[PDB]
Amino acid sequence: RLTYYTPDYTPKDTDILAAFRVTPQPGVPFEEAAAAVAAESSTGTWTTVWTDLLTDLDRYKGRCYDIEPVPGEDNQFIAYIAYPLDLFEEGSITNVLTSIVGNVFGFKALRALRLEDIRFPVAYIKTFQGPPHGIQVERDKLNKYGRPLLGCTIKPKLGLSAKNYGRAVYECLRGGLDFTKDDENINSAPFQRWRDRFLFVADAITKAQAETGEIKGHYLNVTAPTCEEMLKRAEYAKELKQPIIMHDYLTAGFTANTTLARWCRDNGVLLHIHRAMHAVIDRQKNHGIHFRVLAKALRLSGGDHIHTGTVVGKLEGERGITMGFVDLLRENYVEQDKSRGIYFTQDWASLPGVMAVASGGIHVWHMPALVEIFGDDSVLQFGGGTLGHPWGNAPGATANRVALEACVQARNEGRNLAREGNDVIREAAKWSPELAVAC
Amino acid sequence: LTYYTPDYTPKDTDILAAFRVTPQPGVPFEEAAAAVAAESSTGTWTTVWTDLLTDLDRYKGRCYDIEPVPGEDNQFIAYIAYPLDLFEEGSITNVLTSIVGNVFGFKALRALRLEDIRFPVAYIKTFQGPPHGIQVERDKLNKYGRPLLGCTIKPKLGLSAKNYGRAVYECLRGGLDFTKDDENINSAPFQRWRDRFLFVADAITKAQAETGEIKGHYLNVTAPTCEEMLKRAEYAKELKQPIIMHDYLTAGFTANTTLARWCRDNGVLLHIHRAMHAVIDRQKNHGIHFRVLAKALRLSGGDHIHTGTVVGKLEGERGITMGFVDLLRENYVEQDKSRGIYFTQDWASLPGVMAVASGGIHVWHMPALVEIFGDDSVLQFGGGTLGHPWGNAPGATANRVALEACVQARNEG
Amino acid sequence: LTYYTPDYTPKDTDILAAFRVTPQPGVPFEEAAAAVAAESSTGTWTTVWTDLLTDLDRYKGRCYDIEPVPGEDNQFIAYIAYPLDLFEEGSITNVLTSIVGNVFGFKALRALRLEDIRFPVAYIKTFQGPPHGIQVERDKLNKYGRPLLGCTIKPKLGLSAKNYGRAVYECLRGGLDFTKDDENINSAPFQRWRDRFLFVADAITKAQAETGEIKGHYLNVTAPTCEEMLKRAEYAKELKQPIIMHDYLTAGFTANTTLARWCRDNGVLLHIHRAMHAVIDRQKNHGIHFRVLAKALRLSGGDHIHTGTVVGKLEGERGITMGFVDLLRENYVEQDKSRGIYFTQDWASLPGVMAVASGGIHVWHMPALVEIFGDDSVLQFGGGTLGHPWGNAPGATANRVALEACVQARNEG
Amino acid sequence: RLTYYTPDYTPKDTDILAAFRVTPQPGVPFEEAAAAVAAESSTGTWTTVWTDLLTDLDRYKGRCYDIEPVPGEDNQFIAYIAYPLDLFEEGSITNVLTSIVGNVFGFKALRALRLEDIRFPVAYIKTFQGPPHGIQVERDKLNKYGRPLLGCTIKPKLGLSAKNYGRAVYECLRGGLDFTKDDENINSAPFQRWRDRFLFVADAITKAQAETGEIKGHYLNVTAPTCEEMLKRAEYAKELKQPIIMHDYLTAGFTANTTLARWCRDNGVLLHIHRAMHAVIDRQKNHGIHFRVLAKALRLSGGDHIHTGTVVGKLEGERGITMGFVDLLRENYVEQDKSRGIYFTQDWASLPGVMAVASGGIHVWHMPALVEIFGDDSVLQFGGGTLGHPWGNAPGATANRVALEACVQARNEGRNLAREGNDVIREAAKWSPELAVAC
Amino acid sequence: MQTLPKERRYETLSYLPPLTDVQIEKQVQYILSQGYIPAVEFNEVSEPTELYWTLWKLPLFGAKTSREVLAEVQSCRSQYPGHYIRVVGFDNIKQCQILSFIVHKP
Amino acid sequence: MQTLPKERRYETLSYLPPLTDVQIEKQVQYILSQGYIPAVEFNEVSEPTELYWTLWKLPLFGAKTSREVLAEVQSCRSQYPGHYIRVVGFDNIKQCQILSFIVHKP
């Protein structure tokens, strides 16, 4: 119809904006493609039979108000599309993702669409629960403020009995590390059931957190077949007095992440969430949905502790693209920073933050890269990228905390972590005899 | 390299996966294959001491083939065997957390697509499967020997629930079987779901009394929460609704398996729309092909998996769009790579679901969806605005008479 | 003085409040304003050390105006901005605990009235709002294009439930839509609520079969407890009652929000009487104006907020009595101080409630409540004793025919 | 009709009397105004059409039996109006406040009505639950008999995280004070959620009440959106083994105060109640409802610990008006004392008392005003009127108890608190070194 | 800026310095002069959990003086020196209880 | 192949060797140099259950140096030698809390 490209339209502060990385077919112009992304998202352009005079025209339609090409690239652009607030149910993302990415990417005259960024207003953020706790409630809940939190992903994920799994929980907890995690297949399985895993993990925490004097925890994977199996898997973690559990928000979806987020606030359990099935969606630079949407579609659906990824092997260009959604994960207001990839000024309305979990190799020397970039406001998983530790999991756990708590301590002496970050770990490998063998 | 074992034969208690893998020139196909099988099951980072702690020779996903795609360089198909003892009995959110979980974000692979997956008879029987198969839910509707008739009542948005129930009604007295809801009608501030279920129920029970046949409406329950999903589910059962609509990739497969175990326990047939499907398929180099998600849904339950229209397809893609139709609908499939079915998969006598595609832009293109899609199909008429004669109801008669004349032409020859 | 910042502009995520403040001569207007914003959010007693502990620069209510009332000395209007991060998502019992909680008992203010309040679109969407808006609950009643017809069945007190259901019945067959309950019929020892719901339900289901239209009765549930309120609520839903009456200032806004979340979850429309309203409004110097409580009810939920009759009002007060009607009923209002609407407030597409006033002393004064109150109004006939011809039923016909002749005169011109 | 002014009518002992501070329009006499307050309260005077011969005439009607002018004032009087017992449901005040103040004050020929006092009979008090505990059950529940109880309203009410709030709970508890309170906006909010507030408050109590050896508590504000959110907010305070919670009985109403009163007796939790939104109603001397009704409409609806107010800045005239409802708050029988403002002899039928909470400034020297007037039977909040304490909250908490427990001790030596009340605090500021800096 | 010392102090009238025997006369004398008849209790540990302390004798009632109460507390603490003794006030006219104050702590 | 010794270590910045007084200056100096105003706390037992430690004084705020913080910690630990003292950082601009580190352990 080309009534969905109104380029003069100033966006309302209560509209829901979306930045589509539009790549049309080569016989399609930029204005007809962008008017087609805005149309079939809400009100399709199949026929015009006697309904152009009917119910609501200027209401209730996604309208494209902006087209800009991508620098250095052709046959593609970025369409900004304004959705009114009254399209969606208040408090869900399963209605965000049915107008904005539902029936949108399968238009025939478009080669590849990618939802880059999305502007949730204050008028729609305030209905959402947000995460069940903050970036600051769970420093307070766990009495671990002053340094980023830690992890030990148990690397033999498949083939461990629940007690032998609960030793690999225990010695990564007995040393330095705080939050040892179930992996993505550490679930119910014939080799260990979750009823028995949660038992033997809860004894691993209770012994470790009572001989090392901290509030240590385990990310209990409560991803299940049903929502009723999941809450029964979550409520059994409540009965063990567990601080944190684990959800998988893209496999299980954005209903059974919200229920568990409604569960985790109601029952005081923290909600770590792994980004399973995310690189089905995030990976291609021309098609899919960027993770910054799904990192902002978790801060509203609910959950602390999102994995953000290795900033180790990334260049200085994709470092800020990671730091685009990480500042959209931990802060309350951002600006329009396209060098960081952020396409919309996002006002979070003091809805609580989400910790930035980061798999950081095993590499002890890659700690000050992960402390200057990710501050005290993050979590550092230490599985993947692992040569192992030649003295074991437990002195390999202190060698991942004395590596941290001297790097955090060197941030607090007025030193820096890019000019002399490696000059702190071997400075600390003199005192602690367990750092110098990890290397 | 211990994860590319080409002499390994796939057991019938293995969960096979066919990945269309695209690395850089600089990564060989054998390392690229043995890395898709690595980080989907057991990572290859630890090789020195913890490689020989426990049973990492039987709990590991392994490759058994590398087959290059014909004509396309740097693009092969890595068939990977996953042992049965890794996954959870009755959940796809452990299947699509192993097989596509942490493997597509592998750095040395520049595109990766799970093409086809084989669930064995050993693993299918752990699932409930669908609430009611075709010959189990042709019985509830009293509708035999002809494909069913969907409809898109989309006066686009902005309807009151009476105004919605005015337009949902007069296609049901027109002859249509079901009049599919918007995806955007989940309690929007102009019509809430409590009201959009009621005046639809006042329409249907006044529609089955006018025509005579059992008719319904695919009521959407894709809620914020599974609690509020089973408040929208249980109020359709209170109003005696035959079928419920549920978006399945936005809401997730835990929302399916919560609701498909609900839907068999309460006799509702669970229509499914493919929300967020084109995020995942539709790229020929990367993602997950729809036939996996049309088979991950037959195990999570839910009838009426939305399929592609045959009209806008080439002759080589009509096999593919009949590829995932023969998977979900027929109780045995054979390995036909020309239509994209990469595995012979017995279905353990699942009550296999009905294959629904849209259409309805033209009334003269009806037997193309009847000579190709059999009696086990819902034909969603794209009829959002209106039909062609006088509106919906003289067009809804023209939508049904244009099929009973063609189903008559089926049995003639 | 840090709480009177007149250069501050009100954000669209601020919850604005307009207080008509009256101090003594001896307190200036700037100190009087900056004390209304003080003890309603953050007290000014601590100034020395604990003033700079935490964020008291962003979590504080602040004044941005002082506007004197014209003609009246010592009486100004202090517009105060409250930040959104102070209040609870979905409760007025935190709004009316901040904004009117501990501020009216300030010693140096000799009268104080919250005139108008602005709830932003940022804070309205946290609420459910009403159970069913007008164009959402004109649909359930099958009643379009004309204002609804309330009634006061008040044979003053002392009726058995049959005798109550004898008089409630024969106004419903007379043509009236609803026949509003007493406020004193909450399980009084002459007729209990279990009985006063039953013989009313025996009257209504025998009234909709005689006339044909869907009729009801505003059944009172204003109980001792919310448990016994949701025993009186759920028994009306058992008897298939369309609308429930609930007093809202005696029972509180927690009783509304418990019941309006009940009433959307069970399809009952939740009529509201203004008990204890004249304690709070009706003093032009002190209290809270009714338009706040007619807007605190649109967020706590409940249809049919009782409004003032236009007949006993002056020409300058007919704007005020149309001021809080246009607030609750229309989806956008503009800042008109001549009718007392002190804020432009978008309603975030709330399903805005119907505006009901009493009347019914005369049959010839019907189009004064029809040319002023539109189709979105219930006209409670003050008909407690009887109507004028032969009793209630020949008067209830005369109460309906005196409107359909006037609604006919509406569409003529 | 003027059938509602029967001046010879002796009130029955089972009637419900009401004292309306009637101020009519200047063209309205005293007898027609008082007959109009009694009429439309129960049975209105709109028409007389064929119902004067119908069901019940001498039954079921509020009748005015007395008119007296106010001394020194004109154009206004006090109408005593008798309501029969059978008008109301037994056990509610939401039917008291719909006859007696519902549709009463909006009669057109009345300038201002004020419900001054109300006589609930023994025949109607005995149906009510009363407060969930007594003035004597909770001296026994808390083992703190012999002196009035204390408080610390946390003065930065807006802008505290729940753990940092739970330190301002803790140090006001670690010192002298017993019952630190949530304020009226300390509720669910984005800066602290109540799930997380109740957690970190319950750890503040558990540490303070186990190192100071008393049964200390916190007034947990369970005022919520719904009654079901409130009980879920109250039952979580039960799960923390909390002695006291907080309701707001005029914002939330007289249903959801009774449910919580039915909750608090059933589950052993004490019910402090703040008087939020009370000066909408109590403040004007010619219109509204006097607090003495709403202090007697809480002792029946249920709840301990009502705020009574500063007796600091009050004269000797409004001191007894405060002491009118305070004796109607703590005692079992009162007389007709109009110098104290009590207009009816109230027999409470040994239904339990309500503690008299009093915000008393911060002023340490204003303790013996609050101990001679309010005895051992009261609670003393110490927020508002606060210059602060220059040594902190915790030595400012002992300086508000050694100021008390020497003033209570000087009441027990045979000394008095009006002639030498200030001569005890500086007598006690020699021993305790923390009193002399508060001053 | 003096800190608050870690002292597990006691329930009522206990933040004062320890009570001289002249003041212990006066406290129970006002317990006498309300028309009330006092009593004595003792215990070993002062817990918040332990609401009850063990009675010494029957409560004293009759026409007696304050020195006839201290014969039990002061003159007869020799069989419980290392225990927590207090004076209890059992206000039976109002079903109340008045002025716990702990006396002779070890 | 050295084992990990059984040591009940402490919450943050505690796996290091015990902090010399030069380093205790520098840690609170960065607590100063964020535009932030520090504070001191102490306790006896460091439990995971016990989330609260007792404040020393009011939190220090004003235009001061790091040596005016150590007057409370270092120069004035003489009345609590056998206790666990730490420095707390109450980040009020973001409603946060920064850099617990335990100082002068017995």
mmCIF file of C-alpha atoms in Angstrom, chain A residues 12 14 59-60 85-86 90 123 127, chain B residues 189-190 192, chain C residues 12 15-16 92 115-130 133 264 290-302 305 322-335 340-353:
data_model
loop_
_atom_site.group_PDB
_atom_site.id
_atom_site.type_symbol
_atom_site.label_atom_id
_atom_site.label_comp_id
_atom_site.label_asym_id
_atom_site.label_seq_id
_atom_site.Cartn_x
_atom_site.Cartn_y
_atom_site.Cartn_z
ATOM 1 C CA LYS A 12 5.831 8.672 20.610
ATOM 2 C CA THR A 14 4.896 5.206 24.461
ATOM 3 C CA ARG A 59 -4.295 3.258 15.025
ATOM 4 C CA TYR A 60 -2.953 -0.232 15.439
ATOM 5 C CA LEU A 85 1.481 0.298 22.682
ATOM 6 C CA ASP A 86 -2.039 -1.106 22.389
ATOM 7 C CA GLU A 90 0.982 -5.739 28.881
ATOM 8 C CA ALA A 123 4.973 2.692 29.435
ATOM 9 C CA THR A 127 4.160 -3.750 33.536
ATOM 10 C CA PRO B 189 -6.384 -3.261 25.429
ATOM 11 C CA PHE B 190 -9.145 -3.095 22.800
ATOM 12 C CA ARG B 192 -9.186 -8.931 26.134
ATOM 13 C CA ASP C 12 5.903 11.978 31.454
ATOM 14 C CA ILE C 15 2.737 11.146 38.906
ATOM 15 C CA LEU C 16 1.506 14.715 39.171
ATOM 16 C CA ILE C 92 -3.634 2.862 44.693
ATOM 17 C CA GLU C 115 -7.896 18.470 43.521
ATOM 18 C CA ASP C 116 -6.600 16.485 40.556
ATOM 19 C CA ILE C 117 -3.956 13.820 40.053
ATOM 20 C CA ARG C 118 -2.214 12.698 36.872
ATOM 21 C CA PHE C 119 -1.320 9.057 36.441
ATOM 22 C CA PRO C 120 0.985 8.713 33.419
ATOM 23 C CA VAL C 121 0.854 6.081 30.697
ATOM 24 C CA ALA C 122 3.975 4.670 32.381
ATOM 25 C CA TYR C 123 1.997 3.988 35.570
ATOM 26 C CA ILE C 124 -1.496 3.256 34.200
ATOM 27 C CA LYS C 125 -0.282 0.146 32.332
ATOM 28 C CA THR C 126 0.834 -1.432 35.619
ATOM 29 C CA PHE C 127 -2.856 -1.573 36.550
ATOM 30 C CA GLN C 128 -5.383 -4.022 35.193
ATOM 31 C CA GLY C 129 -7.820 -1.153 34.962
ATOM 32 C CA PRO C 130 -11.547 -1.861 34.938
ATOM 33 C CA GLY C 133 -14.992 -0.844 29.494
ATOM 34 C CA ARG C 264 -12.410 -9.645 34.967
ATOM 35 C CA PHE C 290 -14.010 13.217 43.802
ATOM 36 C CA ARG C 291 -12.221 13.280 40.438
ATOM 37 C CA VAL C 292 -9.171 11.719 42.106
ATOM 38 C CA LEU C 293 -11.389 8.976 43.545
ATOM 39 C CA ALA C 294 -13.163 8.638 40.193
ATOM 40 C CA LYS C 295 -9.695 8.097 38.696
ATOM 41 C CA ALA C 296 -8.280 6.005 41.539
ATOM 42 C CA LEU C 297 -11.227 3.694 40.811
ATOM 43 C CA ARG C 298 -10.529 3.434 37.065
ATOM 44 C CA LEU C 299 -7.102 2.091 38.071
ATOM 45 C CA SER C 300 -8.395 -0.100 40.907
ATOM 46 C CA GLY C 301 -11.098 -1.344 38.566
ATOM 47 C CA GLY C 302 -14.858 -1.295 38.811
ATOM 48 C CA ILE C 305 -18.650 5.134 39.109
ATOM 49 C CA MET C 322 -18.853 16.830 33.658
ATOM 50 C CA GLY C 323 -15.192 17.124 34.630
ATOM 51 C CA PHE C 324 -14.879 13.791 36.391
ATOM 52 C CA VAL C 325 -17.251 12.235 33.854
ATOM 53 C CA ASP C 326 -14.949 13.018 30.913
ATOM 54 C CA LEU C 327 -11.992 11.708 32.957
ATOM 55 C CA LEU C 328 -13.249 8.178 33.625
ATOM 56 C CA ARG C 329 -15.137 7.753 30.336
ATOM 57 C CA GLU C 330 -12.992 9.308 27.583
ATOM 58 C CA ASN C 331 -9.590 7.920 26.588
ATOM 59 C CA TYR C 332 -7.921 11.365 26.521
ATOM 60 C CA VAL C 333 -8.521 14.510 28.577
ATOM 61 C CA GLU C 334 -7.134 18.028 28.296
ATOM 62 C CA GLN C 335 -6.102 20.547 30.951
ATOM 63 C CA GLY C 340 -11.361 21.182 37.327
ATOM 64 C CA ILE C 341 -9.290 18.895 35.084
ATOM 65 C CA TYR C 342 -5.854 20.231 36.008
ATOM 66 C CA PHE C 343 -3.841 17.796 33.853
ATOM 67 C CA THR C 344 -3.715 16.573 30.280
ATOM 68 C CA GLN C 345 -3.843 12.810 30.895
ATOM 69 C CA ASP C 346 -3.727 10.121 28.239
ATOM 70 C CA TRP C 347 -5.469 7.008 29.520
ATOM 71 C CA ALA C 348 -3.160 4.420 27.838
ATOM 72 C CA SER C 349 -6.307 3.015 26.186
ATOM 73 C CA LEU C 350 -7.865 1.939 29.436
ATOM 74 C CA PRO C 351 -11.273 0.345 29.031
ATOM 75 C CA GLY C 352 -12.819 3.447 30.556
ATOM 76 C CA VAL C 353 -15.839 3.086 32.806
#
